[PDB]
From Swiss-Prot:
Expressing tissues: Found mainly in the developing eye and in the antennal disk. Also observed in other imaginal disks tested and in the embryo. Expressed in Johnston's organ, the hearing organ, neurons (at protein level).
Compartments, as annotated in UniProt: Membrane; Synapse
Superkingdom of source: Eukaryota
Chief localization: membrane
Annotated GO CC locations: COP9 signalosome; cytoplasm; nucleoplasm; plasma membrane; presynapse; protein-containing complex
Its biological purpose: Adapter protein which modulates signaling mediated by several receptor tyrosine kinases such as sev and Ack. Required for proper signaling by sevenless. May act to stimulate the ability of Sos to catalyze Ras1 activation by linking sevenless and Sos in a signaling complex. Required for functional and morphological integrities of the scolopidia, sensory neurons and the antennal mechanosensory and motor center (AMMC) brain neuropil. Required for Ack-dependent suppression of apoptosis in the eye.
Entry annotated with the keyword Repeat: yes
Protein name per the record: Growth factor receptor-bound protein 2
Length: 59
């Protein structure tokens, strides 16, 4: 499973994952939290805004 996120931001709280625009992020679980999503990166897990990403699986 893959999801993209284009926004270069620097998180506010420590449990807020920062990132770069157009980054390719790994997604862990989607469903009980449409607005808040749990993504993964290099092995580290974290909280972020699902609104800065979109599914790259149109097909």
């Amino acid at each position: 499973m893959e999801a993209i996120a284009k926004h270069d931001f620097s998180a506010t709280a420590d449990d807020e994952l920062s990132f770069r625009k157009t980054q390719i992020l790994k997604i862990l679980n989607m469903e009980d939290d449409s607005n808040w999503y749990r993504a993964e990166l290099d092995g580290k897990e974290g909280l972020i805004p699902s609104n800065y990403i979109e599914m790259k699986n149109h097909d």
